[PDB]
């Protein structure tokens, strides 16, 4: 038991760091979805002007 | 306890390939092979009193091994298995000669 507690603690911390990578990834995933939609709408301006 | 016997007291730097059976605070019974890098020290290598003090303990090899093993085991006894393996050498080396200098 006193060694399984150590295994659980280290694996939980690594799971949290894996969630860190995942959540930071999803975070700028959102922002870059956002910025590319920015450029798309910037020229959808010309789309709808000329359409 | 009494295995080797020789006519000469080796004063040069040497080691003891000793293995201890320690137990940490998580009760983790683990044996561990030690070295005990040792060497005799004599500031005045002609004085009869100090020179004869070399042969004070007749089993200096066993005395050194037992003392270091005892203190190492006692200090690892206060730490979890996770700590005893993260700072393995760190805590065992401060176990042998625990101080702050």
From Swiss-Prot, chain A:
Cross-link Glycyl lysine isopeptide (Lys-Gly) (interchain with G-Cter in SUMO2) - where? 45
Q: Which domain of life is it from?
A: Eukaryota
Q: Where in the cell is it found?
A: Cytoplasm; Nucleus
Modification after translation is described as: Phosphorylated on Tyr residues after EGF stimulation.
Could you give the subunit structure recorded for this chain? The vault ribonucleoprotein particle is a huge (400 A x 670 A) cage structure of 12.9 MDa. It consists of a dimer of half-vaults, with each half-vault comprising 39 identical major vault protein (MVP) chains, PARP4 and one or more vault RNAs (vRNAs). Interacts with TEP1. Interacts with PTEN and activated MAPK1. The phosphorylated protein interacts with the SH2 domains of PTPN11 and SRC. Interacts with APEX1. May interact with ZNF540.
According to its UniProt entry, what is the function of this protein? Required for normal vault structure. Vaults are multi-subunit structures that may act as scaffolds for proteins involved in signal transduction. Vaults may also play a role in nucleo-cytoplasmic transport. Down-regulates IFNG-mediated STAT1 signaling and subsequent activation of JAK. Down-regulates SRC activity and signaling through MAP kinases.
Q: What is known of its domains?
A: MVP 3 mediates interaction with PTEN.
- Could you tell me what this protein is called? Major vault protein
Q: Which organism is it from?
A: Rattus norvegicus (Rat)
Lineage of the organism: Eukaryota, Metazoa, Chordata, Craniata, Vertebrata
């Amino acid at each position: 038991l006193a060694i399984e507690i150590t295994t659980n603690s280290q694996e939980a911390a690594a799971k949290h760091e894996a969630q860190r990578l995942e959540q930071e990834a999803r975070g700028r995933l959102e922002r870059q979805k956002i910025l590319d939609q920015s450029e798309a709408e910037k020229a959808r301006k010309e789309l709808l002007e000329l359409e | 306890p009494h295995a080797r016997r020789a006519l000469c007291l080796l004063l040069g730097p040497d080691f003891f390939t000793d293995v201890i059976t320690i137990e940490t605070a998580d009760h983790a019974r683990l044996q561990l092979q030690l070295a005990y890098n040792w060497h005799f020290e004599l500031k005045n290598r002609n004085d009869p009193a100090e020179a004869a003090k070399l042969f004070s303990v007749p089993d200096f090899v066993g005395d050194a091994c037992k003392a270091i093993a005892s203190r190492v085991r006692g200090a690892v006894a206060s730490v979890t298995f996770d700590d005893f393996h993260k700072n393995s050498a760190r805590i065992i080396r401060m176990a042998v000669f625990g101080f702050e200098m």
